Design a protein around this ligand. Structure first.
Ligand SMILES: OC[C@H]1O[C@H](O)[C@H](O)[C@@H](O)[C@H]1O
Length: 305
């Protein structure tokens, strides 16, 4: 019967593959089929929408590849009598202000970013690094609000625990992926020869991993590096390696909730004109490291590791 879209900007990340698996579980429970389309750039996004109107879909969940496409995605969907829910990244108007009217499902970004900052400082104390030869590398993507609130929340926590403000160095990355973050961290590294230990701050696992691979290339051994990712499911290949590395752990939020919950809310609204709440913030988070990753994921239902 009913066909609903689930469009994601980055199908390569296990984060979005998980949302897709859980949207499928909601289609089997509620009686709808989920059409799964990758939308890595804005042209594919707008095309994908035409494509869903041709398959007869009545609505879609989307994680847009650029928040500034919001108006266009809304104009096209209104065009085809399709309801829209945004997952993870909020639509913004042309001036950059949030479009408050499309229902949104996202993580509590500031709170998880603060947890990241508090865990970096606890591991730094466990290792006993001297703060005078340590520094924070913060890889930022400030044009995306969800990314910006996670890195600022993390820098803010670090400064609140007492890490010196002037030894916090920010560098923007051009893409939210390993090659982008690598290039960014590499450029920051050669500018600071005085630093003997680094904390790496990034909004997600791929961003922290690019950071860590750059440090390795510049001769830091793992004891001198601490990076902690966000997404959990994306760091399982790192945490499964024989050897420990500078990537110490990752904060596991709930992509299963993002996937099923937005897909069930879209269906209630398409099928019973039941209006979704405008804003749903998911606060779940657990620290996974090489010691508990397998247990914690099996415990959240994401079995295998
Ligand atoms: O909501 C969490 C989600 O936030 C953004 O969309 C990131 O690019 C993803 O990798 C994921 O971390």
């Amino acid at each position: 019967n009913l066909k609903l879209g689930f469009l994601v900007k980055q199908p390569e990340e296990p984060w979005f593959q998980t949302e897709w698996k859980f949207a499928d579980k909601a289609g089997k429970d509620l009686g709808f089929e989920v059409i799964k389309i990758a939308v890595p750039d804005g042209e594919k996004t707008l095309n994908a929408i035409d494509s869903l109107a041709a398959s007869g879909a009545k609505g879609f969940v989307i994680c847009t590849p650029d928040p500034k496409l919001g108006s266009a995605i809304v104009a096209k969907a209104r065009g085809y009598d399709m309801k829209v829910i945004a997952v993870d990244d909020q639509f913004v108007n042309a001036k950059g202000k949030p479009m408050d009217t499309v229902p949104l499902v996202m993580m509590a970004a500031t709170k998880i970013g603060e947890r990241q900052g508090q865990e970096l400082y606890k591991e730094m104390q466990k290792r006993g690094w001297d703060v005078k030869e340590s520094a924070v590398m913060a890889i930022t993507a400030n044009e995306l609000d969800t990314a910006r609130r996670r890195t600022t929340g993390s820098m803010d926590a670090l400064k609140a625990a007492g890490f010196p403000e002037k030894q916090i160095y920010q560098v923007p990355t051009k893409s939210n992926d390993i090659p982008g973050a690598f290039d960014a961290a590499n450029s920051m590294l050669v500018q600071h020869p005085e630093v003997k230990h680094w904390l790496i701050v990034g909004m997600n696992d791929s961003t922290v991993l690019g950071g860590v691979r750059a440090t390795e290339g510049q001769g830091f051994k793992a004891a001198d590096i601490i990076g902690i990712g966000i997404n959990g499911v994306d760091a399982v290949s790192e945490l499964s390696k024989a050897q420990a590395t500078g990537f110490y752990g990752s904060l596991l939020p709930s992509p299963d909730v993002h996937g099923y919950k937005s897909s069930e809310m879209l269906y209630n609204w398409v099928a019973k004109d039941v209006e979704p709440p405008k804003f749903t913030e998911v606060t779940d988070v657990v620290l996974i490291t090489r010691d508990n990753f397998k247990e914690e994921l099996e415990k959240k239902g994401l079995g295998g590791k």
